[PDB]
Symmetry: C3
Subunit: 422 residues, 3 copies
Amino acid sequence: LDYPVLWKILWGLVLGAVFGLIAGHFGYAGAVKTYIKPFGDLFVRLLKMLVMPIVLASLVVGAASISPARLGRVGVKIVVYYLATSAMAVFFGLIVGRLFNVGANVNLGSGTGKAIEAQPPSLVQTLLNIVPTNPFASLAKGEVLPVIFFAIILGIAITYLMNRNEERVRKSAETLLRVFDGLAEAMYLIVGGVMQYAPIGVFALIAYVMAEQGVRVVGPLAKVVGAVYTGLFLQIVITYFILLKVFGIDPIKFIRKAKDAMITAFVTRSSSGTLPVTMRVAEEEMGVDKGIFSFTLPLGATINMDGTALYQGVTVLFVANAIGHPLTLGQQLVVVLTAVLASIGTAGVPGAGAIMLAMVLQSVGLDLTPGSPVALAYAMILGIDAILDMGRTMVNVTGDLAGTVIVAKTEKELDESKWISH
Amino acid sequence: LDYPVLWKILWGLVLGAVFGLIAGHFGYAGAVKTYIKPFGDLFVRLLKMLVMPIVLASLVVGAASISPARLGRVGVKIVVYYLATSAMAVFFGLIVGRLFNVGANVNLGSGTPPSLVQTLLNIVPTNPFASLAKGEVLPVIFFAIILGIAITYLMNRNEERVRKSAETLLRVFDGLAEAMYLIVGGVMQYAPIGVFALIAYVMAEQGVRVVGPLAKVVGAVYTGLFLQIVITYFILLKVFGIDPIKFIRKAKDAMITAFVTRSSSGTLPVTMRVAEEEMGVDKGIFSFTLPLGATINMDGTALYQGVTVLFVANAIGHPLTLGQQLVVVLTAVLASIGTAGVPGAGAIMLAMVLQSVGLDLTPGSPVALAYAMILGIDAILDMGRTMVNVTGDLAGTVIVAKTEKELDESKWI
Amino acid sequence: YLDYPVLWKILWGLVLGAVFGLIAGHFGYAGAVKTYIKPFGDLFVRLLKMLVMPIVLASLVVGAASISPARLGRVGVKIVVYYLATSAMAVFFGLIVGRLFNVGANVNLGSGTGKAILVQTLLNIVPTNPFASLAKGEVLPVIFFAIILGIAITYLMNRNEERVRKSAETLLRVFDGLAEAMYLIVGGVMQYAPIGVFALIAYVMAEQGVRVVGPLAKVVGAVYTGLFLQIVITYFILLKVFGIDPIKFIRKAKDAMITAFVTRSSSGTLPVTMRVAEEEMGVDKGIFSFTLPLGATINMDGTALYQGVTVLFVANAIGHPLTLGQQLVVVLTAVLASIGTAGVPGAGAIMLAMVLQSVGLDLTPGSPVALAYAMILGIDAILDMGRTMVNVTGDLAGTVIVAKTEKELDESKWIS
């Protein structure tokens, strides 16, 4: 029968979260899961549908445009960008976590230090596994990063065929490129259609996440949730804003534009499954060239270490203090750095944080055996994980946009007409 | 060689069925399975091959033509039709099982967490490429319709790059679809040999078993088809102004293929080519209605389940009135919607229905002994179950077609 | 401080790697070879694996769209006759070269059980889901679907309706564009090829080269003398008979041969074999896009050598007497049971194991025949290298011979 407002996706967030909270406090969280949540599963399923086609096609079309040496430059830039913001996330994660003093109370356990054969991640085979041995297979499996490799090789090769002298060579290559282009275009059209549904699906998703885990943010857990979020906020408001401003980009204009991707990132808790919304934003909103965002955006849905360095800095310090194990500021740095290195090869998927935490705890030598104190801390964190996941993913997508727009500004943004107010 | 002539497919059927019957009664069915059967396995393998490309390509081209408001309309029509014809199937199955009094004798036993969100939600594919790679027809149908609908909006868009890119893309799908129909055309030159091999086996293996009280079950289920086709499909066709006798003559290839092949979804290339090359239906209709009804069509299930639930009921002595027999069959029919046509489905579903009502299927108990009898004629039954579906799948595709763009009346006059 | 491209490097990367491998191996450093060197060659292998499915699908839709279904059937029957001809030669040489070297040198004793000793595979050529078969990496069904598509596209481009024709050309144009792209990229990888070839033989030599001392030297010795004879006698003589200069052939086949050798996969060398077939032998896409991937599957040459030698090494080590006749019957059986499989590393030991079972020999642990099998298995990589290399070479020789019989045709590629 409706609805007129176009500021709705943000309305659906707030109304949903408030509805979720109330439904949960009154014991009705069970009912949300049944009647409301599946609408958000639909929202989520549809976005999932577009991720392989949009990413594959947009990057064939984008590496075919621009050029391989310029493409190379955009890599070094988006990577230098991610080290910079990663150090800030690490630093803020340590600071924000100490301030709230998250290990408030109360149980005792048995200390340890780095133990059980102390190996950092393999990370050779992680690299060799970028090059897909069957492009068709990597498309059928969800694998983003090999598709990125094959899409870039296909694109660069396509362009080389179009400067070849023979006419058959040039007309065939172009028909091919034309097909990816038409495909990419259809995809972007569709996500716009999906986004018409988005505020209902955004509503259903925090309604559930709030009714389930919203009731749990009481007590000593409030402080970790409280800490992880002032940490996000600091990362955005200081390191992203200051970074945008230094490159001559208005920080407030950016957020009004990034908003759809941010809210979607948040509720969806998947970088890879927000990629369709993010990319359309990079194009229809930020005015970024496909030759840029088709590479940097899906690459950063994997490589961005910001939200893990944030999350990991807080929860390691929470476990450390609940179980009584003294952790100096330095050893926390070396732990978070290990988790961050260890996270790089894997893309953003919901649940990733608790999973990664379990790994750093084990490896550092703690016993995660049942009823143990340290198994009890992890289990507390694990119970607010969706709440934390939402902010982990959202801080990542935001910075994913923020670096895409900076690197773009550095060659062909170029479209400044996209930002003028009237 | 060389044999080529036409209209062999009806010949391969009758001749193979006779070869099979003769071969089975003298006990040589092992040799039929070894030496003859694989030739028919090949006919089935080739048709399976064309199903994903034919369905993907034909619907992207078909939904790119026409328009989404019209597309929605035919959806509603083909759904109303598949409901309507289902009622007739329920009714006839209920009656023929009673008339034949299929359950007869003699052994004794006693008797009397839903979802349907995740089923609907599972229509939307999370990886379109995986869904093409796995079988998954219903999600491909979804992605193909979105893709086509989207392609058309781009071809009406003002920008010049956009418009020619979209049309390039559409042409690739058109070219592919065009190639597929050529190939399925080719396989149909081979079809009567494979139709021959397939009933040759089905007659040689399970044919000798159709003696006795099981014949009454077969008699009842086949009286249901004939009654469904000849009464409710014919009457429905005449009601919308379509000649019932020309229809059968044309569906003939898809029907015989449906019958022998026992896969609704795997007769789909032949059905679609029949739907187009014979019935003269536009791609914009059958590229939706035919593969959708190869999943959603409930007719042959209400027939099969009506006869055998009543057969089990009477064999084990558990009384079910005409009314409570209906309520069981309605349940089995609802549970069938999310699933496409597959050669084991009848017995699998039968087993499930015995379960839910609480009957004990442990060996060697009567309800287990009753089901085990049905399971032994299942192929004879599966052949008629699918043949009636593809027949009705065509009939609604053409009826729904007649109401907008059938439109081609030159194909029959 | 490295240029490096002097561009005759792929044969250099091999010898320097092989020698580096031996030398590094004798000094016990193979552990470091496995870590620091090896992955550079795994990279080389991974890039080529990537290109196989598109290079093959695209090349054959375009190649079967060109030429014509009656001619294609002839090059089919011709390439099959070729592969039978060259196989009998491999069996013959495998029997002779193994006896000549007399591979059963030493020492242990055994009996075993005896003495004494399809359809669904063919049906499995026809893929029930082409999209699945592309993803699962199944060459023969992709080959089948590629030919039917190519043939149908050609018929559609002859159809009277203009739309049908313009669509079909679009479709065909997409595949040609793709194929052309692939060949471009494999051209690029070959720039990297000698570094990766160095790394691979470096590893294979550092690990298994050290084992080739003693009575295993003879089996490695006999198999390579078998390879040398197959190429230098039956490929050459067959090439001359059909009028092709044998020494020019080898210089051209060189990139594919070495890639084959080092990667030990007939099918994952396919991109390099197909590029050679095109940019070097001057063979038409309509010929080689069929014969080469088909021969990466059906070619029995390299198997008859491995099985002719190793069945006899097991035979003589285990003391079980085999007449020249009974050795023949085992190898023929092993070859028949072998066809459906594409080139994969480790394939040799795998097949040997089976013939041992079926003949009734007992492979129980600590057994004599079990002990013999293990020795062969320990030099298997060394044997694999020469096994697949001979196939890829002969794959080319039959591809250009059947090519010579219709449209090779490009004689301009070899002159002055």
